[PDB]
């Protein structure tokens, strides 16, 4: 049916939409968690040093 | 459906439009991470 | 040929009957042994 | 030493057709249903279903 | 019976956990995935454990495309049902009538057709364990029974040694007797523990032996050699280092591959797979990296997740 | 001359890094491989740049099994040798008469026929730049020219814009006449430097033009739109994020085509590459991940990576 | 020549190991290094904490 | 334009030939043997090719 | 055959080098066209 | 060159013996890591 076809359009489009967004910004996220961490550590050692 | 040779090139143009507008947006900036 | 068939699988199933009674009276035999020697 | 071969067989034989018929389409609802009502906080169906946290 | 049971024998572990510690534990079979995958896991509540699983693996031929997949848990029942795209549906049940005593039931349908559909009780003793399964039962006019019946047999001998048997009873049509084959197994365990042996002279003069050692908390180790006319076998070597941060497994196999699978845990939520493996007979490589995210859907159970 | 010089401009960039901003910065073409690799990399001393690199590819049709390569480097000389599988020879010279002006030579060799061999001088001034190179020279009795020469000018017409040209002479065998094309190259820059534009009316009628834009000191991203009977070009949108700790590149092809490529560097030494990419026209991934191990050889360069 | 088939003989064999210690190691060095920063950052907090 | 016939041309080419038949076995060896010329510790050449650290 | 490719060939070279000519002065040219406007 | 059906098992099994001999050696524990 026309209303299963769209039904699968949109289906197929939304998994494409999840599966680009996973790719392009799990990889990003990681390096924004890394980096948020690492300037956590250097403000722990500053706290530690005064 | 008219597909013409000319069809590529529009839209190829528009794509680069709309990206050239995007990226000099303020949108990219608040793309950017504050911290 | 279901002669022979039907003969290897009942044979098969009783000697599994066989072995399982072995091993369901197994420790007892071990405790035997040990006590033996 | 097979002997099951009676009326019971067909009985179990349309059983198992009408339970794997029932259970091809319910089984999933089977099991969202039992933790929806189990969960005491009880979300919403499109919540539930869908991947986002709610809390 | 009286004075036999002075012996107080453990309860040795079912016949399908008898590899559990090297198959499962210290080897990527299961584990393995190619190409990209992400797994989300959504958590409802722990208490009564409920679960909400989506897959979306990409590249892999085994894996599908979408998986969605909800398991619920309780103290003495366990369900899970997993809708796959192409709309093929995967659900097992199990059931415990009593702490020891379970009935488990799987049944696999794809496109209409009960492909698979098993039903088997787990009957647990003090020194024995026996489970049988029937896969596609079925009845038939004739009367002889109809489909592959399982049934697995296996005593502890000794506290450090377990013996059992596991008979196959299988019948494709039914017009002709079905084939029925016996396998032999043994599980021997260490008196400290350390280290587990287990034996399978599986049918068909099929032999898979394997072993399992406990080097340390974190490193265990165990070796899995495979038999099969002219036999066709390989022998594998695994090894698995576990830390609070990331689950390592390496394996060298007879075959020539090397393969390995490193699980980061970046956060408590999120995991990060790596997989790769590479066959020397060949010069050939599949990798696959992934994702593992655990979010909670209730205020409590962030709560715990937060600790 | 005289008068005309209080124009004091400033001198653009050479024609190759016309689209470096953006072609070898803010995109993946140049760092994109697949399947696994290792790169070890060896450093002997600082003040003159020497190198010892190695590789080990395995699964990527374009990388080879194994090359080795040894770059040097001073304040006026630059090579580069490079070993590879099969005995495939590459190799590279930089030598700079003047402060401004280097002649550069590269040469590609495999099985013992020298298929490339390009000689380029580069002269750079105030306000203009060019370059002139020859491909595979040679000369022929007949005593016309052989092979490929290529020349190209870029003068600055203002601070803000440069234009140039870029003229192609080819002639394959020296029978025939050989074909003379030239092209026409545009860079524009921002006054505050923020965004960069470049466009590119190459021969044949092929147009590549990009641009390029600064968010951030860690942000920074670009456009790249390509056009070649019928014409076959596609649109790219790509950004790059810079951390201390980690590089991510991420790209969008108007072919539906979606790659990222994040760089850890797990230590100021061993950095770790992931690069993935997926075809959403044909629904397929090609995926790689990689090593960069860089481990000096001297007691003074180790003291200096260490801080 | 066959002192030219040993010699590439060895040199496949000892890229092969290499490849396999590589792939086989990478991973472990990583669980180790990250394992061993962790139990540095929990010895960091005691310090601080006395 | 072109004028460029005479026996400049073959010295030119026979240079190209002897030049390019030199480098094809030689210029790696040439890199080496100038880093390890420059570098002030001139490690042994059997470390200098391996991909170990010596210090 | 080779006539006509050897005079599009030139023809394009002395277009080139008009076009570097015009590059060349092209500062200049702006300089004016700002001191008219 | 002979490759007989059993030469399979005997490979098989003395790759099994080995690595049984190797996995229960002090040099497994070696492999541990002392951290």
């Given at each position: 049916s026309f209303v299963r076809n769209a039904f699968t359009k949109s289906g197929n489009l939304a998994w494409t939409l999840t599966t680009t967004a996973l790719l392009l910004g799990v990889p990003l996220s990681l390096s924004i968690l890394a980096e948020q961490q690492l300037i956590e550590m250097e403000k722990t050692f500053d706290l530690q040093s005064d | 459906f008219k597909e013409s040779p000319l069809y590529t090139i529009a839209l190829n143009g528009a794509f680069f439009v709309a990206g050239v507008a995007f990226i000099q947006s303020p949108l990219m900036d608040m793309l950017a991470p504050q911290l | 040929e279901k002669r022979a068939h039907q003969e290897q699988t009942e044979k098969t199933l009783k000697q599994a009957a066989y072995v399982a009674a072995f091993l369901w009276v197994s420790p007892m035999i071990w405790h035997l042994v040990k006590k033996q020697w | 030493s097979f002997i099951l071969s009676d009326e019971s067989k067909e009985r179990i034989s349309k059983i198992l057709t009408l339970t794997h018929n029932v259970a091809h389409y319910g089984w999933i609802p089977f099991v969202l249903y039992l933790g929806w009502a189990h969960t005491?906080?009880?979300?919403?169906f499109l919540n539930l279903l869908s991947p986002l946290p709610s809390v | 019976h009286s004075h036999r049971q002075s012996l107080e024998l453990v309860n040795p572990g079912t016949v399908e956990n008898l590899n559990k510690e090297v198959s499962?534990?210290?080897?990527?079979?299961?584990?393995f995935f190619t190409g990209l995958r992400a797994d989300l896991n959504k958590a409802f509540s722990m208490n009564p454990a409920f679960q909400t699983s989506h897959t979306f693996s990409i590249?892999?031929?085994?894996?599908?495309?979408y998986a969605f997949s909800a398991l619920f848990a309780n103290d003495n029942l366990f369900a899970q049902g997993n809708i796959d795209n192409d709309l093929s549906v995967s659900g097992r049940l199990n059931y415990g009538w009593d702490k020891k005593n379970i009935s488990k039931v799987n049944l696999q349908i794809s496109d209409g057709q009960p492909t698979m559909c098993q039903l088997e009780q787990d009957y647990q003793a003090s020194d024995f364990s026996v489970n049988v399964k029937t896969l596609n039962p079925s009845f038939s006019e004739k009367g002889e029974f109809t489909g592959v019946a399982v049934a697995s047999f296996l005593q502890s001998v000794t506290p450090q040694l377990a013996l059992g048997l596991e008979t196959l009873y299988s019948r494709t049509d039914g017009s002709a007797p079905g084939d029925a084959g016996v396998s032999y197994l043994t599980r021997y365990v260490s008196k400290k523990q350390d280290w587990i042996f287990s034996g399978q002279l599986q049918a068909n003069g099929a032999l898979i032996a394997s072993l399992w050692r406990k080097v340390a908390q974190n490193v265990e180790a165990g070796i899995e050699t495979t038999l099969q006319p002219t036999v066709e076998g390989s022998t594998t070597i695994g090894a698995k280092y576990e830390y609070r941060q990331s689950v390592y497994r390496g394996t060298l196999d007879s075959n020539g591959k090397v393969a390995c699978f490193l699980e980061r845990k970046v956060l408590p939520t999120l995991s990060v797979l790596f997989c790769g493996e590479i066959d020397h007979f060949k010069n050939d490589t599949k990798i696959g990296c992934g994702l593992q995210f655990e979010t909670a859907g209730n205020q409590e159970l962030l709560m715990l997740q937060q600790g």
């Open positions: - | - | - | 005491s906080n009880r979300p919403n | 499962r534990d210290v080897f990527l079979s299961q584990y590249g892999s031929q085994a894996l599908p495309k």
